[PDB]
Design a protein around this ligand. Structure first.
Ligand code: ZN
Lengths: 244, 86
RNA sequence: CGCGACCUCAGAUCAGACGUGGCGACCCGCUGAAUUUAAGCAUAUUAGUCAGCGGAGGAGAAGAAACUAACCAGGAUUCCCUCAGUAACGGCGAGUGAACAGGGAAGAGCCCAGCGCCGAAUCCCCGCCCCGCGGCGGGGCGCGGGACAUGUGGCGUACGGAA
RNA sequence: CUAAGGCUAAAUACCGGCACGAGACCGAUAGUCAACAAGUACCGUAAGGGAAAGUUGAAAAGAACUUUGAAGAGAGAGUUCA
RNA sequence: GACGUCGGCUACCCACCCGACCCGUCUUGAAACACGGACCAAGGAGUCUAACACGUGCGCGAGUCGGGGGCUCGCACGAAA
RNA sequence: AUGCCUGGGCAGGGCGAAGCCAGAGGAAACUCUGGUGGAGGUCCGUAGCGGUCCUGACGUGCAAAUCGGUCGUCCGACCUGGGUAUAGGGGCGAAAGACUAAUCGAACCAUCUAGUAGCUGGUUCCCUCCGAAGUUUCCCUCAGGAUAGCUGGCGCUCUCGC
RNA sequence: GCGGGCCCGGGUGGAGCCGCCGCAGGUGCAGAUCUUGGUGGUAGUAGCAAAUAUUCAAACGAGAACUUUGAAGGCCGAAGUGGAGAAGGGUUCCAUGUGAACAGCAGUUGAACAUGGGUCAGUCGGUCCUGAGAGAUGGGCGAGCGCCGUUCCGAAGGGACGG
RNA sequence: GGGCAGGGCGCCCUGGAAUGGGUUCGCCCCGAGAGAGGGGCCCGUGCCUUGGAAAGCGUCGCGGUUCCGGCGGCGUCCGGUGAGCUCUCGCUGGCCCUUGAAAAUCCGGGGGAGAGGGUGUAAAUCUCGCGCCGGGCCGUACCCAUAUCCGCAGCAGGUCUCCAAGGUGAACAGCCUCUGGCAUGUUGGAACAAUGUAGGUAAGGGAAGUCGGCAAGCCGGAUCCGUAACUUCGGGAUAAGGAU
RNA sequence: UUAAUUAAAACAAAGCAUCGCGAAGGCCCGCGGCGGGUGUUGACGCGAUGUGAUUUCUGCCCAGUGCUCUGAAUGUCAAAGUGAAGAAAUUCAAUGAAGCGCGGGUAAACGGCGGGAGUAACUAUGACUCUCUUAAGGUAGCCAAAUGCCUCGUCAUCUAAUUAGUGACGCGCAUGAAUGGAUGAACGAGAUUCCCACUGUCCCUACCUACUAUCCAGCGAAACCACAGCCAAGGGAACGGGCUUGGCGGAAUCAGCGGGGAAAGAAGACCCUGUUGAGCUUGACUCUAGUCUGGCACGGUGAAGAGACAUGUUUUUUCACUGAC
RNA sequence: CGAUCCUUCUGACCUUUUGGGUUUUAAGCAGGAGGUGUCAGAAAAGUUACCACAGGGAUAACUGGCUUGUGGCGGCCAAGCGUUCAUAGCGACGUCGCUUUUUGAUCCUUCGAUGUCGGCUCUUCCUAUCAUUGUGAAGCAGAAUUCACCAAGCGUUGGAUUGUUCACCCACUAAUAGGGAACGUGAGCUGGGUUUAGACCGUCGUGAGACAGGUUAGUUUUACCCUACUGAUGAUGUGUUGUUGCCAUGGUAAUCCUGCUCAGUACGAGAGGAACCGCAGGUUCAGACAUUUGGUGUAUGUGCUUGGCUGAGGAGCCAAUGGGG
RNA sequence: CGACUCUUAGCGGUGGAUCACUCGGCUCGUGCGUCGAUGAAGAACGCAGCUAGCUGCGAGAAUUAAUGUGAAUUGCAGGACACAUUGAUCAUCGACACUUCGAACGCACUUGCGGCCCCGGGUUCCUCCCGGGGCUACGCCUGUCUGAGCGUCGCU
């Protein structure tokens, strides 16, 4: 009957992210001649808190070697980074915490964060709150490397793309229980309108396939094929095994 | 509550006077008339509202130019001449 | 290391003109249902219809066969009678449904590309003189410009044409 | 017959626009919603909805003037064939 | 029997005797404890087109026809004839 | 109804968490006593917000949902003005099929539309003559049709108290 | 005249109407919770009972319980029945005059009616800026009205100092 | 505007401190320089001064038939206070899996690209003190709510804010009063019948009425004692129960 | 939280456990686009669910319906391509993708978790034993519960009396373990039982006050209305104001009153019919967005290799380049 | 055992296949088959308690109508019970009736609506008589007792449980007899549970949903019209008024029990145990009245007090009746 | 005979029914068959001595000019006119004029901010300021001017 909840999130205008107070996109420095051949030095001016993000950000000031200007970047602060610290970026940068260098140069077993899944995308992998990627082994031929992601998947990546040494600052955030409806409400108010979740079983049979009936029961198997039309695909999406 | 109590708080208006048709239809938020479609170049009209179409037609207004056009056509659409003087 | 032609491509409050919108009874090009009928209802019917969009005129569209016919043949298009509620279509049910010929209203035929012949013989714009200028034309004088040979103009088009 | 190019009035249609003629049509609850300051008054935020409402008298000759009452209202008088 | 007397069946009012339940409709069955109904004035519902079938009237008659068009008028009567 | 932006507001009291001070005991670990502190989606409670009970008043009312008493909450998932975004098989919903301009299990206006009804209701002057049936069979037929039957009208072919 | 109906007499009325032979129709009302309009019983009835409260004297005035003045008694008891605003209304604001109509009694009163008057800004705000957001050009889609998008497939600054 | 009280400083100088010191309601600070002295800066909305007593107010008395925004005498003074109410400023803390806005506009700083006259003058004055001219357009009344808005209305409904006196009182609770506002909320008079609506009171019993303690009633503030079962050890709790 | 009958045991909530996704991605919007939301985002994230503080646990079952995994070891398998005879339309043959069949996993997926007999030195119950059956046959717990027809179950307490309340029993029509079981400090305008105090709820009503109701001055409606209104019996269409037989009846009214007018209201909400509909569901009949797969075109260059036909053709497998994208 | 349309087979030297000719193909004529079991022949799963519309009293859930199977009640015969003895009291095997206070059957009135159970209050009526008055009978010695007759005048209670009708228990009493009046009584009341919409549990269904299976919260509108009734002015006649009175007619009212004496008597082996007339009084009901007791109390009568206000004393007022004797 | 009530009749009340009128509709037919960037349709605001509405008009605002006709308009005054004079009113209308939005055009819609030229006040171009006048919207056609290209080329 009605359009079920979840379909209406795609259109937006209610479920859109609250991004007014956010400090901006957390991207690595753009690849250029300095980072490609040598290294560029920047100063960690300050560390700031990004609303709706567990990890704190760090403003780093570099100097552009083409015009008399000082560039500013919003890196994702690795754990241990402090203000008044020099960070070095590039192929010749030393292997220290808070230094973004290509994963090809760094040795095996290196722990990195804000990894670039593709060369030049300014860092996309393992950058949530405390997650980190592990460099497993390098393949000098074909210029490829193996990376263990926080989810446990091993991905083949290019050696050209860069990564920041160290884990992301702010680990152990999920250890503390929320303990309140209010804490969760304030957490999700800074992110999006998705916190109050109503069970489809408790819903009417017109706003959710699981609704209806004189008893609160699903009635049909929760596991559903992933090749199902929107509106019906609800519950466990293409579950392989559903047990404990 | 939904009735007399709710009718009390009708404090702010949504429609204003349109500057193309003169009706109080120009919607402030959408910036659209809904009676003539002011932001749209073309006048809004539909065949399913015959009475609404006849309310504002060519003959409804002054026709300050159309009447003189009709008179000029009737007399021959002539220009640049005067009747014989006394 | 620049300049000078050409091909593609931009800027102009460059000089001169053009379109926008409205009405929409009639017309043209699209999109386009359901009430209704079938004693239900799904193909059908309502129906290329209502609604929606775009485009002009005093009319518009169509129009001079890649036609109709099988006859001793007719000969652009449009409208009326008839063909005819016929051939034909359809859960061959409800229902839908032309065309040819014949008699009238009117009646008008034509033009390019190509093929080819002619010195681009062609066309547009700006200056001067004469006529006239309130739907800006005609002639003459301009080593004044432009378009055109990646094709303008005259002859010429299926009824043959050119020399 | 000669497609993949083009032009063309005539007989054709016209519930809109300008100006006319006509009626075995209705005659103010009828005929257009609208015979009259009608798409007017009015209603709804809006798309939109939408009325009721003609008649003194030939001629205002529309009752001068006296009188009761604060006045509305009367009683006389007068105009008019009425 | 003829200046306060005659005839007026019908219509005005009253009295008496008998009879007599409120109309329309559905229904086998309505006065119904079935439904509509305060009263009055105006309006108000089997029309028109087309296709048939039957019967009747008229004209012609193995014939019949006016559909459409044309000839007479500037249309009063005529968009008739 | 929800999301966002920009502003405003929320007396007086109770409980007395972290932290800190002093005293006493101890061999240490540390522990008791008296204070300071004012945290809490803390309690009573006003403004504000909402509407449990009397199934009170009224119930052609003050009111197409109001009034009295008693009520829950009142520092946080709080209340609220303005601007803005989501438009109808759509929106939104701490989820009641709740709200979407006094209408919501599909808003409002106009048109198709004088949509269809085997079902209700109604169906307009007089007199005269004739005058019925609820039965046959068939139909997804049982509140209806068709078909015979009952009926009326138009006649026509003949016989005759001639 | 069985009847539908019709012919005379009287009163009002003042300008058109009818009989017969034929034709034509939007042609006859008691009902349809019929449409429009008007009028009755109810009925001088229900009612003019939410938030404590008025009294005396005088003035104007034809007219006084409701107006004004003076005095007395009261209430709202500074989160007020006080003084100013925002949205909204648009002359409701002021003075004079009237009591035709409204203020569910009345009124000499009113926010009623009729006449006239009233809003004075560099400093108070709009105007300026941007927020959530809306919306052109470029580009793409779309039969089409238009839609998608606000930096995205752009030759995107017509600005400035010095020479 | 000038000056000074009064606050704040994460500002400087001398000096180096355990016998630890300074200090707040709490905190907190110190060899990365505490206490003790001398200074510096910011706000100074407060006090004095120009404005400014000329004007305003409270009184006493006159000019003027009347119009008349008049004329004059004086006063506008001295002190203390408070967890007192409101506003503002400044420190100090606690909370966030909340971190709590953009732009217009203005200013400061690094540099010397460039200018100046050459020994009495000049370029410059992010102009030091004056002097001259202009600032255009729109709204400006009133109501802002038991009668000026929306609910068919002069409707017990709804509608966003500022100002917030005295007494009692914990209190912006309720009640009484001052400034201010009004005639009791679309009418008055006469009696006080029955039904009612809203308040009360009742001998004895105390829920025996009723589906049901529905309704009403009981307790209620403060001070001093006391406070169980259970428990997540936080609570229960103003438990319960006593005296004033 | 249902504005306007339901403020609740309902919703939500932190806590707990699953599922998809490493970006040419997961979910979703969109007629359309190199479109858009999550996303100013990256597994401690986003999206979809179930249960719903703490403690103690979370038993067995994949037979059924789902979901998911690989798999030329393959039955079915459309279009396109290939071969065949025919004059051709053609039909036949081979080949043959995804999906269905075939094989595993998954129940904190949907869900489910039995019936007969014999048997212990009085009886009784019954350890224990036998047979038939499924994918296991309900485990720990709990209850005559908000869940129990019999039923007002049996026993004890609470009363003088209790279908109510509380504590134990399991025989449970038809309790039960994240369709979550048991417990549980604090709290609840949630539903019930008892006790103390309290009182007009009552015994049993009485009195007082204010505002109406009453009357008057002024102003003044509305619903409803076949005609109107006294009863007993009879018949009637089966309960009469009218009819029949009797009883009887007397102007105009005031304040109450609720027996009657089968009183007023809404063309009954219930039931049925209609070949009238709408909301919702699916193992109903036709379909459709979306999604997966196969074929043709955009779609090229180079290098090798193999099968088949045949004595050059097709299928082409793999590896490289970018010039399309 | 089967119409149209469609398919398939058979037959003709069968017709057409359109400008003519040939051959495939196709369309034709005739005769069979494939099937419509709802069988004169639609292609077709559910739910709605969120519901909607046109109608039906043709058709259900109320009452009232005919009948009385069933329920209740009463007779006829007599084999027997009754120590002997059928009829003191009963009565089998059979049989005849009465009632609509139970459930049944029919659908006659009502679906343009007759408000659907109980309880409270209130009036009247019936006897199929529980008790009281008057009597008959015994297996009646007294007491106690059942059976029957005239007989409805007066009575038929207070409570625990349950919404209950019904049902059981406690206590008192003469007795706690049975029923009707639209299963009396919702413009009289309550809404407790049937019976809207929100929810919880168990069973059933894949599902939406269903449950004479349980639980909780869930708006009870209007009289001023006519009649009936309670009261109040009144009304036609008596010439007008006043007086004191009569009376037809209606209504009707009192009821029951305890103690003393009789009397520990009659009777009786004993145990036990009366009755008539008298005296004192009580239950319920009816009509009044306030001397006393109690209640109310705003004579707002008189003191006492909290907050505030007239400067204070005095005298006062405000705080919807300030509170309290 | 009273009051009230029922019927009929006369007159008088509410009501506007019937009839008779009609500067209005409906239908058919004929001719013409015409809008706009030189600014359309429509809308807003103003214009009369007394003027609210309708109609008419656009700061030249109940109408200007010209032609035709020839003594009025009128609800009242004022009156212009000598009606032997282009001369009152009317019709025609060919000249002039035509405020603000609106395809609406400098950007937006507040009636706010501007740019490039000219003129006047101010000035003695001296830039401000004030007022007035003309341009400044998109797409597109021809031509002109200025430009870009590691596109194709020939000389140095
Ligand atoms: Zn408009």
């Amino acid at each position: 009957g009605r359009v079920i909840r979840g379909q209406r999130k795609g259109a937006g205008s209610v479920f859109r992210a609250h991004v007014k107070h956010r400090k901006g996109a957390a991207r690595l420095r753009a690849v250029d001649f300095a980072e490609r051949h040598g290294y560029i030095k920047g100063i960690v001016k300050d560390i700031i808190h990004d609303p709706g993000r567990g990890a704190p950000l760090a403003k780093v000031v570099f100097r552009d070697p083409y015009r008399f200007k000082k560039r500013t970047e919003l890196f994702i602060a690795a754990e241990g980074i402090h203000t008044g610290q020099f960070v070095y970026c590039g192929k010749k940068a030393q292997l220290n915490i808070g230094n973004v260098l290509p994963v090809g140069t760094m040795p095996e077993g290196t722990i990195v964060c804000c990894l670039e899944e593709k060369p030049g995308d300014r860092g996309k992998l393992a950058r949530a709150s405390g997650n980190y990627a592990t460099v497993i082994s390098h393949n000098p031929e074909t210029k490829k490397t193996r990376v263990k992601l926080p989810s446990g998947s091993k991905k083949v990546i290019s050696s050209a793309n860069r990564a920041v040494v160290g884990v992301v600052a702010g680990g152990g955030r999920i250890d503390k229980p929320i303990l309140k409806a209010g804490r969760a409400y304030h957490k999700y108010k800074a992110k999006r309108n998705c916190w109050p979740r109503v069970r489809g079983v408790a819903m009417n049979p017109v706003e959710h396939p699981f609704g209806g009936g004189n008893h609160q029961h699903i009635g049909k198997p929760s596991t559903i094929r992933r090749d199902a039309p929107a509106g019906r695909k609800v519950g466990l999406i293409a579950a392989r095994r559903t047990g404990r | 509550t939904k009735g007399t109590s709710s009718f009390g708080k009708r404090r702010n208006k949504t429609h204003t006077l349109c500057r193309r048709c003169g009706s109080k239809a120009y919607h402030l938020q959408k910036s659209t008339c809904g009676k003539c479609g002011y932001p749209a170049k073309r006048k809004r009209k539909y065949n399913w509202s015959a009475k609404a179409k006849r309310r504002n037609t060519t003959g409804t207004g002054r026709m300050r130019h159309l009447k003189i056009v009709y008179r000029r056509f009737r007399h021959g659409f002539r220009e640049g001449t005067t009747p014989k003087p006394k």
